[PDB]
């Protein structure tokens, strides 16, 4: 077989990066716990994106339904689709919002999501090459999964702050126009 | 964030490089005999030899190729040359009045087309990561050896074709004399 395992240093580097990712997913479960799902697709989408980023982390330690690079490339494209639908929703929430400090906070978090979705797309290549460098034949791109996790941790972080900022933007819309406002709030926040 | 090949696989490369140097020496031999000029078959044979040296050296940490894309480009150059060589020996084959020889040269000319193709395919030297048996493993580390093998097979067919081209010109002259109305397409001077 022309196959070998990743070197222990990189395996440990992978593992320590997946715990960092689990802390941020903890935060996401905490935040979404509080809220009923019906009438809130921001919450549903955040859960979907977390579900997939879970397949992607599992991949890097040897578990989950992701088997080859094109699986990982596929996962990243789903996350980006779900993020794009989150952007549309949250954007609409920001347009109802009358408090500009919170309108602008929400819109800024949407930039982070677009950015980290992009970087997740790039990193999902987990590309590996043989290279003739420095007088030796070497394999490079062994950290390609370490960079994949750090993209997911960053995206996971931005999603949490985006859900929080969508809720704040919502309370300010109701604060100003009331729960009988002629136009209903874009998403509902119940328990 | 990089690593060197397993010794298990480094060893398997150096040994397939050895079989390659062997076949290269047969070519180096046969080419010292002759004189470049008026013989583009010889010239093309050496061009194919140098690029293949570039390709084997890559697998040993040496030479100019650094990327897969360099290896792929080398294999493209090699097939370009093999194509220019096929044109030349094809003409030499048409001249051959003997048919046991015309056939041989056309046969080796088809082994070249074959191995140029297999070299092209192998020059990708692709490496994957995948999730297999609860592990993160790198695959495709045996790519270098398939590349050398294809180089060696190509090398051999070049030696066969250079020799068979000499012999096919020899038989063109035994029959139509060193005063033949049409010169031999290739000239063989020591």
Residue numbers in the entry:
A (entry chain A): 670 to 860
B (entry chain B): 671 to 860
The study reports:
The structure of α-catenin (100 kDa) consists of three distinct domains.
We observed a nearly two-fold increase in the cosedimented amount of either ABD-H1 or ABD-Δα1 compared to ABD-WT. To examine the structural details of αcat-ABD with enhanced F-actin binding, we determined crystal structures of αNcat-ABD-H1. However, unlike the monomeric αNcat-ABD-WT structure, αNcat-ABD-H1 crystallized as a homodimer connected by two βH motifs. Moreover, the observation of αNcat-ABD-H1 dimerization, which occludes 3100 Å2 of solvent-accessible surface, in two distinct crystal forms provides a basis for further examining the physiological relevance of this ABD-dimer interface. In addition, we performed chemical shift (CS)-based Rosetta comparative modeling (CM)48 to show that V796N of αNcat-ABD-WT remained in the cryptic state, whereas αNcat-ABD-H1 displayed a large conformational change that exposed V796N on the surface, resembling V796 in the crystal structure of αEcat-ABD-WT. It involves the βH motif forming an extensive dimer interface with the hydrophobic patch uncovered by α1-helix unfolding.
